[PDB]
Amino acid sequence: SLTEIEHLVQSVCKSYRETCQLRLEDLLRQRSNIFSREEVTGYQRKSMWEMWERCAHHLTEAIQYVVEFAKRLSGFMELCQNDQIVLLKAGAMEVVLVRMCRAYNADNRTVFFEGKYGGMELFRALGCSELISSIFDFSHSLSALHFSEDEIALYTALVLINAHRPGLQEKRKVEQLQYNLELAFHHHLHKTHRQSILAKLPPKGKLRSLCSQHVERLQIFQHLHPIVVQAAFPPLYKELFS
Numbered sequence: 653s654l655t656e657i658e659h660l661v662q663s664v665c666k667s668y669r670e671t672c673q674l675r676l677e678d679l680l681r682q683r684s685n686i687f688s689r690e691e692v693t694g695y696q697r698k699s700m701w702e703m704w705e706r707c708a709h710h711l712t713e714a715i716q717y718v719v720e721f722a723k724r725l726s727g728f729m730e731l732c733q734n735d736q737i738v739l740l741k742a743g744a745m746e747v748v749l750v751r752m753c754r755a756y757n758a759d760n761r762t763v764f765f766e767g768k769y770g771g772m773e774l775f776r777a778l779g780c781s782e783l784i785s786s787i788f789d790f791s792h793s794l795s796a797l798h799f800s801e802d803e804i805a806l807y808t809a810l811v812l813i814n815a816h817r818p819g820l821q822e823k824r825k826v827e828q829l830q831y832n833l834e835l836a837f838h839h840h841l842h843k844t845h846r847q848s849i850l851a852k853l854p855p856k857g858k859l860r861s862l863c864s865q866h867v868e869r870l871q872i873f874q875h876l877h878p879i880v881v882q883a884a885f886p887p888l889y890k891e892l893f894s
């Protein structure tokens with residue numbers, strides 16, 4: 653079924669376009685819009701816990717857009733609730749981290765944060781310089797790929813739809829969706845002469861490690877200074893918060 657695979661491509665790309673938060677052309681056009689030294693100092697002088705509150709809410713919103721992305725993938729809603737949650741819990745943050753490279757400018761090592769670009773020194777008050785370096789380095793490695801929007805869409809669909817996540821109840825069902833998405837992805841890369849990015853994708857385990865460190869830090873902050881979540885997905889909220 654040739655056009656069926658081209659269908660799933662069009663349905664993944666449309667779900668991505670509807671949930672990607674900012675258009676790539678907006679992010680690229682804003683690259684010259686950079687925080688001043690005075691603006692950077694204002695961020696650096698904020699409380700740890702205020703910068704935590706800002707970052708936690710940006711990350712919560714980002715996760716919620718990823719959940720909406722997943723929900724709009726043909727086949728995801730047909731999975732059982734348990735498996736939907738298993739996949740989102742394990743992979744939604746991984747997708748957020750991947751999505752970050754669109755907002756990263758490798759020319760000057762800045763990210764688009766709250767309306768302008770700035771470097772990692774913007775986040776000094778968080779006292780997480782190791783994790784922030786690891787996030788910036790990761791986005792720096794991905795930015796070298798010059799990911800197109802469809803490549804990020806199909807790749808992040810596969811970050812989510814991974815039949816190897818422990819605890820799946822209907823594994824064959826997740827496998828079917830996974831194989832169809834893998835075919836869609838490989839067909840698209842062939843069509844665009846972009847198969848060369850396959851060897852350049854992050855090693856399996858690299859994204860897992862960075863996300864587990866990231867989520868562990870967020871859980872520590874949340875334990876010390878809980879934020880109020882505008883909760884839209886009760887079964888998933890219940891798995892992350894306590």
Ligand SMILES: O=C(O)c1ccc(OCc2c(-c3c(Cl)cccc3C(F)(F)F)noc2-c2cn[nH]c2)cc1
Nearest residue numbers: 711712740741744870871874883884885888889892
């Ligand atoms: O609207 C809903 O109902 C809703 C919204 C977000 C949800 O979780 C966000 C999240 C966080 C996070 C974030 Cl973003 C910010 C602060 C603290 C955490 C913590 F404490 F959980 F670590 N970290 O990891 C995830 C995650 C990984 N996979 N899925 C989610 C869940 C449900």
